[PDB]
Amino acid sequence: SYAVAGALQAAVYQQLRADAVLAALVGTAVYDAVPPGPLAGTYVSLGPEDVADASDKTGAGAVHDFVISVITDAAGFATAKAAAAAVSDALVGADLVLSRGRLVGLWFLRAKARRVEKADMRRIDLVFRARVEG
Amino acid sequence: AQNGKDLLIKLDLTGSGQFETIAGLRATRISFNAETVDVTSLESQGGWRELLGGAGVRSASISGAGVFKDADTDERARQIFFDGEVPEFQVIIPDFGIVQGPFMITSIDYAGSHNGEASYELAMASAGALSFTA
Amino acid sequence: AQNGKDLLIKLDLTGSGQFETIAGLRATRISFNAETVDVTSLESQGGWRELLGGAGVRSASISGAGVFKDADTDERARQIFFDGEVPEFQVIIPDFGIVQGPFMITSIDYAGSHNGEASYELAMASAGALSFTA
Known part of the structure; x- marks a missing residue:
């Protein structure tokens, strides 16, 4: 990663769990590190980033196509699509504040949505682009 | 840096100080030009x-494009072309600011295919004095 | 070097000292002439x-062309052709200075096109002594 991405994940995690919806759909189950226990089963997960270095002569920036996946164990997955509807409106047009550097925009990209393991879990990825500035 | 979504172009609905951004506007370019009028004498510094x-003479041109969204402001650009007017357009630069110049509406072209969206491009050219309110 | 848009030709509104530029004039020219009176003797050390x-005799010819902007100075150019008089004119060579002579407006002509603007040309001839105020 570049210098910003340590604080970019800390900002897009704190923008979640303060959004009013998805505190009523997913609950407290927004985490990178999944805590030990019984695995609630409608969680979201925010880790797999990748950077693209949109830089210049004066300073440097980056383009983060970070992935926020929504997992559900429900029978259908209109539960996950309702949960990622709550993910995406919390992030597009972010106006976040970072700890190191700035971001200028948080857009949306590809969002694959398929059946993952043994046709039982339903995971829907959400790729968001974050053009940041170091 | 600054966001690309905050760089907008906008119309005169009523014609007197009423500004609304146009439509689905996927791309904007305010584009300036100068006619580089040459004065080179028989002696000039070693041949430069x-x-x-x-x-x-200096000018500006606006090239906007995006999806066809029928708004109060998309139909306004039609009425400028058929009844030829030079209203006070306005291109806002994220951190520079309002330009506030009279442009004509030189080229409008609505396009559509059998499998995609309804789109339009929208070309302009200058018609008077621009400004810069910072 | 010196810009051409500071080569203004001025007309009298009241006929006494109130000098204003005519209208939107796009090309202007003051043209001086001498008469080359030949005195070739029998002896000219080689026949030069x-x-x-x-x-x-010496003369000055004004040639001005531009767009029809119906200023009061343009109507004062029109009427002095009709009751044909020789009022005082003033050409400002941009950092030479002032020419300040009387001129007769020989040819005025108002031209328009279906796809163009209304344009006037304007040609004047020397009517008396010329000066140079600088």
């Missing part, structure tokens, strides 16, 4: 071309 | 054409 600057 | 200099 000398230019005058302020005597040249 | 000898000239006299002081004897030839």
Whole structure:
């Protein structure tokens, strides 16, 4: 990663769990590190980033196509699509504040949505682009 | 840096100080030009071309494009073309600011295919004095 | 070097000292002329054409063209053609200074096109002594 991405994940995690919806759909189950226990089963997960270095002569920036996946164990997955509807409106047009550097925009990209393991879990990825500035 | 979504172009609905952004507007480009009027004498510094600057005519052109969204402001651009007017357009630069110049509406072209969206491009050219309110 | 848009030709509104530029004029020219009075003797040390200099009559011809902007200074150019008089005019060579002579407006002509603007040309001739105020 570049210098910003340590604080970019800390900002897009704190923008979640303060959004009013998805505190009523997913609950407290927004985490990178999944805590030990019984695995609630409608969680979201925010880790797999990748950077693209949109830089210049004066300073440097980056383009983060970070992935926020929504997992559900429900029978259908209109539960996950309702949960990622709550993910995406919390992030597009972010106006976040970072700890190191700035971001200028948080857009949306590809969002694959398929059946993952043994046709039982339903995971829907959400790729968001974050053009940041170091 | 600044966001690309905050760089907008916008219309005169009523014609007197009423500004709304147009439509689905996927791309904007305010584009400036200068006619580089040459004054090179028989002796000039060793053979380099000398230019005058302020005597040249200068202009601006706006090239907007995006999806066809029928708004109060998309139909307004139609009425400028059929009844030829030069209203006070406005291109806002994220941190520079309002330009506030009279443009004509030189080229409008609505396009559509059998499998995609309804789109339009929208070309302009200058018609008077621009401004810069910072 | 010097810009061409500071080469203004001025017309009298009241006929006494109130000098204003005519209208939107796009090309302007003051043209001086001498008469080359030939004095070629029998002896001319090889047959070179000898000239006299002081004897030839001298003239100044104004040529102005531009767009029809119906200012009051443009109507004062129109009416002095009708009751044909020789009012005082003033050409400002941009950092030479002032020409300040009387001129007769020989040819005025108002032209328009279906796809163009209304344009006027304007040609004047010397009517008396010329000066140079600088």
